[PDB]
């Protein structure tokens with residue numbers, strides 16, 4: 001089960017951890033992927049989760065896109081968690097580096113409310129270009145279900161905890 005997390009609120013927990021290593025250890029019902037609309041898992045969390053599935057996540061995702069078309073920014077889909085989780089909830093936070101509306105971050109976090117408990121990264125953080133402090137604020141103010149946040153970067157984890165209101 002989830003261990004070593006700092007409790008931020010009644011339902012939001014945080015840990016300085018590699019989400020792939022966390023997923024392999026916990027085997028959560030849901031691991032959230034920081035997806036893009038095409039489910040092209042190239043880098044960041046998506047690239048790391050996909051590599052851990054030996055590319056099975058990308059093969060499954062390509063079939064999903066062939067059938068359904070792209071997701072919306074702020075949207076999600078539930079696919080297999082492969083060797084990492086029962087399910088992977090692919091959530092598209094806005095990518096500020098692609099000029100996407102940062103206001104869609106709340107809509108992206110609303111997807112988490114469809115799942116009782118999730119292992120997740122901070123949406124739109126990292127290579128998506130948004131401020132991770134703002135992402136954590138939107139997370140705690142939007143998500144009502146139990147969310148265990150894995151923050152890879154140690155220095156960022158310390159900054160997130162020390163500045164948390």
Ligand SMILES: Cc1nc(C)n(CCC(=O)O)n1
Nearest residue numbers: 122125126150151152153156
């Ligand atoms: C600076 C940085 N490096 C990464 C990865 N990020 C995204 C948030 C995290 O650490 O999980 N932000």
